[model samples]
Target: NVFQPVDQLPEDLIPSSIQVLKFSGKYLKLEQDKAYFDWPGFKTAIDNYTGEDLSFDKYDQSTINQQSQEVGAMVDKIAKFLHDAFAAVVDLSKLAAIILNTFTNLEEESSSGFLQFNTNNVKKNSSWEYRVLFSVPFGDNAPSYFYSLVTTILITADIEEKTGWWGLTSSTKKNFAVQIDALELVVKKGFKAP
Candidate 1:
């Protein structure tokens, strides 16, 4: 009821709180720590941070935990590398969700200790064939030939190629490939609308 009614206010004058406050024609003052305490201020801080700006208002341990826990290092790296309009193109919440899903998948595969690597299997195949000649039927000699086939398959090309064959703990070369690939796909590939 409080927030819903506040929504009806003209945009310019939506105060952060619904609680009526004391005002005096005489000089009035508020403590620096206590003045203007409400969710609107909190939301404003977050919006500013999204624009690469920081406001000290209500920044505390919980805020730190939330930011660190929700943010994905890979997503940040990818956004930085490929997205020219990263501020607009990257959504932190979506990035957090994607990272959470990836981590969950990895955790499920962790028993084998090869989540990313296990995603791809290299298969080897070899075959040989030989033609047989019949001497009793038409009395005609049949040509004989031999053939061989061999190949390898990487079953998870997108996962293997994009995420790399290495596990999450990989060398710089391999890790960089994954980071760069994600950037190319999400940002350079222009998945985000202009």
Candidate 2:
């Protein structure tokens, strides 16, 4: 079914090596019946990132925060490069959300609309899902050797149906899953990792 608009990854975004990471979180309580994702946790993970393919069919075991010093050094270089490039735009958590949302649109109407949450609002469904294939670049452009941030998300609304005279909702357990991977980049002859 058409859950929402899907922005498929570019065919050219293929990288040389791929890495995968997964993070699980829940809808944290914001009120008696309201909750949210752990932006702080997201903030931490993104700050340390900067990978490699298969629809995750096969990928390197190492995550962004930890990898061999040799390959990791390359990531660090681009990580630093990204830091300097985006120095004007901090708020790492928010920035990361903006980038990811372009693909998933969790803030949009397709899902629960968590981005525009309010005490008066409630979810339309008990569960929902989204996916994004975003290309990660070192600077303003792609080298044909750049990495793409490919990810998928599935969310669960943890509240029981509105009940009783006041139509009150109660918790039913909440959490979300995110699986991330960046596939291969194939360049013309005489190219090396940047």
Candidate 3:
């Protein structure tokens, strides 16, 4: 029984040989690295657990790959535009998930490479018409329609007069041509908040 208890600690960490060293008191004389030696359990303890902060390195590659792979240029451009345009009204990261999802739905319902918006609600005579009619210029060749979609969907307004159109209005579309600094500012519109 006594031997059993004594055997456990060394059995777990004894490659250092448990020599029970000489010069034991002189152990403090060297630098920490030199003094520590094989020092059993050091690697065992470290390998068994990791700090929350230590995850940053382990996550870099996968997170980078996921973020990039999730959306290519057209989708990314729209998402980025939406983020900068509405960051003042909500969390930027939260918006990232939303815009990505919207594009995903667009692709899922769109059989062709040409993307379209949700149409199920459109036939109900819903005033929120942008859900189905996606005649805007959304490709890299047509950023005007791209920003129009971004702005229309996220803009706080639901006006039917002009904002309801596929290309929106010339006033709003001006932002794309002149190169808007921030969109909501140009349109005098607000963002949809929680």
Candidate 4:
């Protein structure tokens, strides 16, 4: 579904990438329940439309009314709630910035985050799952290539640690994997290192 705020997007939505960045900083602070169904108005509408109570628990077969086709009804309820939630949030650019920033951090240890994807069937028997992928950046944005420097230093150290040499091993493909994993985590956690 398309999430357009009919009321009007924050005026800055029309600016440059830098303004988008600044607006993103502002948007991240907007509060929202990550769970869409929990919104109060959504719950009321679900009961009114379906003549039955709808909930996020539809994933549980026992809670779903198979004979009643509650699956479709539940999806409709959720879609409406999500629609309202999208409308109510005035500073979405900020929210996008916050979520995106979480992906762009340069210094970090280990972290996690979620991404959403579209599906053809929402009310079906299939279950929804969130994914967490981690990887490393070739260079750090914070210190302007500190990431690359750190990896070089790490390779040099690894070689010394293994062979008493001042350089990396000739077949040290594993080192790249290690560095990449760390970078992925930094980006995933939105820059929050472990």
Candidate 5:
């Protein structure tokens, strides 16, 4: 379903060569339960939407600190589910290794709820799930309206083939899926009008 405030990306960036894909549309409601959430895909989609390189250089200390503070309270929920779902001894080692890796590479971790908006300027084009908000560029006369629906794109890198005993040495591809997972709207109507 199309609505106002649709901000299309530049053609050059669409269907990116780096195996990127876009999934746009509403996904979640405000203040909904955070269970069964997909944080990595959410972050990846946003990064793809913004055209921000997902390399190690994309995030800074400020961003990492902010993300950690925002996501810390919810980590336990995800961690517990991951732990319980994969309880084998071998799985535990792999799980521990990933968590430890995240600790050391915290700066490269994905983030959530990066998009911000003002409620007053946002109008629901249909139900609460579809809406748009306007923004004015500096020194520009016309403002741009953006949809409230979730839109995310993410990229995956090349994978190498594994050749070893009984495929036990096979390596899984290194890529995170992307999806429009949630909608977080904090209205700031004081800035502009729709």
Candidate 6:
């Protein structure tokens, strides 16, 4: 009985192929309620650039190739706009998984993309208030509605008005002024408890 003790596997049976991605950069932060204070203006700019409405409900599919490319380009523009406007870091390094757990609604099917928020501590008194992460599944265009839906969330931070349309729900603290109605994408002036 070479395998009498099954509790511990032999050293040769162990897996050693785990990958470790190294990332080094300064984390970013926004003082509480200021996260969306100027987001509405940014949405206006996007609307003007598209020369049409930028509503998530307006999204529809034509052909696979055509629609994918169209929506992807739209997302790029949106990402660029945020980067340029806020000078906020858009770290795609962790793009493998978007991490949308803060808000409690999701489809069982794999998501094409995701965006999440949190805080990061770098040193004793140095830290970033908000850490936003965005990503899309491999070989897929971000869901067509993702850009505009995110646009609405960030612009207003009013989850109630948009949740009926976006089907989202938020589980956050009361003191958190920047709140997501259904799918809250909110922030506050300084550190507020979770």
The numbered model that scores best in TM-score is 2
lDDT of 1 by residue, 1-194 (tens): 11111112222222311211110001111244222123343334334433211112211111011111112453344334322322222322333333334343443433321122332235321111111110111112311211111001111223334233234321112111231111001011101111
| Tens digits of per-residue lDDT for model 2, 1-194 | 11111222234433232222222222232555434444355444444433221122212112233222222233234334333433212223333433333323333443343222222235433433333333333333543433333333332333233221121112212332222222222222122232
lDDT (tens digit, per residue) of candidate 5 on 93-119: 333333333322323322223221112
TM-score for each of the candidates: 0.20, 0.29, 0.21, 0.17, 0.18, 0.21
Return the TM-score for candidate 3, rounded to 2 decimals. 0.21
- Candidate 2, which segments miss by more than 4 Å at Cα? 1-95, 99-108, 111-125, 138-142, 160-194
Give the RMSD in angstroms, all C-alphas superposed, for model 6.
20.2
* Candidate 4 to truth, TM: 0.17
- The backbone clash count of each candidate, in order, is 0, 11, 0, 14, 7, 9
- Per-residue lDDT of 1-194 in model 3, one digit per residue for the tens? 00001111212222211221111111222343222222133223324433321111110000011121213342355445544444232333443444444433432433421222222233321121112111111234422211111122312122223323243321232111111122121110111111
lDDT (Cα, 0-100) at 88 in candidate 4: 27
Winner by lDDT: 2
Model 5 score (lDDT)? 0.24
Give Cα-based local distance difference scores for all models: 0.22, 0.30, 0.24, 0.20, 0.24, 0.22
Q: Write the per-residue lDDT of candidate 6 for residues 98-167, one digit (tens) a residue.
A: 2233233332311312222323233211111122322111112322211211222221121232232133
Report the alpha-carbon TM-score of model 5 versus the true structure.
Answer: 0.18
User: How many clashes in candidate 6?
Assistant: 9
Cα lDDT for residue 170, model 4? Answer: 26
Ranking by lDDT: 2, 5, 3, 6, 1, 4
Model 5, poorest ten-residue lDDT window?
Answer: 59-68
For model 4, state the Cα shift of residue 163 in Å: 50
Which lDDT value does model 3 have at 176?
A: 15
Q: Give the root-mean-square deviation of each candidate in angstroms.
A: 30.9, 15.4, 27.8, 21.8, 21.1, 20.2
Off by over 4 Å in 3: 1-71, 86-90, 107-150, 153-194
